[PDB]
Paper text:
Among these actinobacteria-specific proteins, five proteins (corresponding to ML1009, ML1306, ML1029, ML0257 and ML0642 from the genome of Mycobacterium leprae TN) were found in every sequenced actinobacterial species including those from the deepest branch Rubrobacter xylanophilus and also from intracellular pathogens such as Tropheryma whipplei which have highly reduced genomes. All five of these proteins are conserved within actinobacteria but have no known function. These five actinobacteria-specific proteins are referred to in this work as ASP-1, 2, 3, 4 and 5.
The crystal structure of full length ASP1 was determined using Seleno-methionine (SeMet) derivatized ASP1 and single anomalous diffraction (SAD) techniques. The final model was refined with native data (2.2 Ǻ) to R and Rfree values of 17.4% and 23.4%, respectively. As well, when analyzed by size exclusion chromatography, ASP1 eluted with a Stokes radius consistent with a molecular mass equivalent to ~125 kDa (monomer 36 kDa), further supporting the idea that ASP1 exists as a trimer in solution. Trimer formation is largely stabilized by interactions between an extended anti-parallel hairpin (β4–5) and the αD region from an adjacent monomer. The first Mg2+ ion is positioned just above a negative ring of amino acids formed by three copies of D71 and D116. Structural and phylogenetic analysis indicates that although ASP1 retains a similar overall fold compared to members of the hydrolase superfamily such as purine nucleoside phosphorylase, the active site region and therefore function of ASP1 are distinct.
Residue numbers in the entry:
A (entry chain A), B (entry chain A), C (entry chain A): 3 to 167, 173 to 276
The structure:
């Protein structure tokens, strides 16, 4: 049943098994899918930065042809000349990656599965067990009533909340969330980091939120990612400038919104 | 093939088989899913009232992990502290229930399956056969050009129309409708009851419609449900008061709408 | 795996095998699904005209119960009296058809599969191989900045572009497109014909576009379809009259739109 959902790449698996043999602690796995709420593209930016900047290769491939609804989110063909020249498969993969140090870690990403989340969670549990994963770490942005002119708040959640140095709510499920819940029920350590992203900047990239999340992750896992922190820092500068001019040049109501949210923020702590 | 879609709870099945042994007529099954048009939440109110008020337990469990698209309708996790504390599975179940008398009946409900309706209908046919179901009964609200100030009309439909004491249309299918159609083709008695709900109150609870449907059901099946009829009656009083003040305090056009629909209604019969 | 997705009708298959025995060239297959962009209903009109006008029968039936999301596009039941009298199955079928000559060809149509496009493409490849298909031909409308007062442009694409007597883009995939891409990778000849349909008439029937596409198809395949060309020609006359009166009687901005698009059109070639 759940094992039918994925297959192993021997190269990636050999390299993992050699990391496991040389370090008894085991590996961290980061995971994040594209398809649920992710205010400010906080998780999406991090996924992009990892896969674009760091050396990696596949270790397990999920069967996206069974898991991904193609009419709902239509993968891109490329047209060149006259004919189809290429196709972006909507892959869902566990990759072996190295940080700037050369330290190995795992990274599970692609489109959020549309279906069969219980079987998918159970598959991810077998992968976590087979690859000696010691900690699984999810991350995303949630839109909040907070100002862009104050630092990004975060909500760490899961069983390893202690790694990031009153509340009872119902949240629409996502595949990562159910994966996290099933992993914890099986005894595995989970953390998650949700960035608090200002509602009114939520539907573009908010690099400050990706940066603040990347530094909680890096602080919690011991992974070292200075090039990515730097690129995000740079984007955040450009983005704060753009946001300032928008508010400054807009509506009275929008100005009054930011000041009203600043006041709420400063009055709390 | 269709048997893979569900499994039996032995406790619930034993209790059913003992009901079957003591009454040769067999049982009635009510069924209603969440996911198609149900003006006034007519079916939804009845589902809620049954499952909340009457003693019941599972007899068959469908494989919701195969049948329910999780990204389209995302089941709720609960967050408590710091971490996921619980999860509302999107279950699809045939339950044994007793009315206020202690008379047994079956109740099939949960999210409307998104996929595989032919295999699902055929599974429900095997369940209906194995559990000695004598009558299957669906129920929902359809939005109509009728006034809230006149009684709820109903359209009984199916092979047992006689149980509720000119027309040729194409209707978007729903899982219950295709189940009803396949059951009838296999010789099984089906009724359905559609409440006529005023368009302009259709997108909230319209307890009058649930009440009028509950009393056709109860009259057609011999089931006795006075506590539920009472709670619905009470809600309907509150709801008629709210609607009256809305129309009375709104637009000229809305007042003119209700009077125009009253006139149409009174001129017919 | 892919063979589970369809079954053969022996009658249709015998008649195909006899066509194959009498003509070594093999057959052409046209295919077009309902569910992706098709400006002006260009492909839809052709599908309708073929299936309504020409003698045909099933050769292969796909398992729509696995491939078609029923809640997303709900097949029609028919209500008559009092009860369900009929049901429009959302079939996906390869049909044997004859043109006005009696020349055989194949026609694959129904709702675009929602899921499992890789397995579906591979199934269509086995069907193309088993039925001696020499050319597979897709066709649809794309909305463009062009005037309704100038002829319909077309973009032929695929490996047999030569049959219809600078450009590098990413296009959302559709099932036909991925089928075309997999077929070409397996050595099979594909053509496609996309009609350029004026944006502002795109969301109804634009018979001129179906006609222009039908004549490229007919010219590329050697099929003869004069009755269908005639009906489309007739609709196009009615449609050009309706569009002229709309523009003529509308906004200054809409008049200025058509003239601005005419100017762009005439300045190119
Ligand atoms: Mg969907
Ligand atoms: Mg599916």
């Amino acid at each position: 049943d759940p094992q039918d959902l994925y297959t192993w790449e021997p190269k990636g698996l050999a390299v993992v098994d050699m990391a496991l043999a040389q370090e008894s602690a085991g590996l961290v796995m980061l995971y994040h899918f594209d398809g649920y709420i992710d205010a400010g593209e906080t998780g999406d930016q991090i996924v992009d930065q990892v896969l674009d900047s760091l050396p990696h290769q596949v270790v397990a491939r999920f069967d996206h042809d069974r898991l991904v609804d193609y009419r709902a989110r239509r993968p891109l063909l490329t047209f060149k000349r006259d004919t189809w020249s290429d196709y972006e498969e909507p892959t869902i993969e566990v990759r072996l990656v190295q940080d700037a140090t050369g330290a190995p870690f795992l990274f599970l990403s692609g489109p959020e599965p549309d279906v069969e989340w219980e079987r998918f969670a159970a598959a991810v549990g077998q992968i976590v067990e087979r690859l000696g994963v010691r900690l699984s770490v999810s991350f995303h942005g949630i839109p909040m009533g907070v100002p862009h002119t104050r630092p990004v708040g975060i909500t760490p959640h899961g069983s390893r909340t202690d790694l990031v140095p009153f509340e009872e709510a119902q949240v629409p499920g996502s595949a990562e969330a159910l994966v996290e819940y099933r992993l914890a029920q099986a005894g595995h350590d989970v953390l998650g980091v949700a960035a608090h992203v200002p509602h009114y900047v939520a539907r573009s990239a908010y690099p400050d939120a990706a940066l603040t999340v990347l530094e909680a992750i890096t602080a919690a896992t011991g992974l070292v990612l200075p090039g990515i922190a730097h690129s995000l820092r740079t984007d955040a500068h450009r983005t704060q400038t753009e946001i300032d001019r928008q508010i400054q040049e807009g509506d009275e109501e929008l100005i009054a919104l930011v000041q009203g949210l600043e006041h709420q923020y400063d009055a709390a702590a």
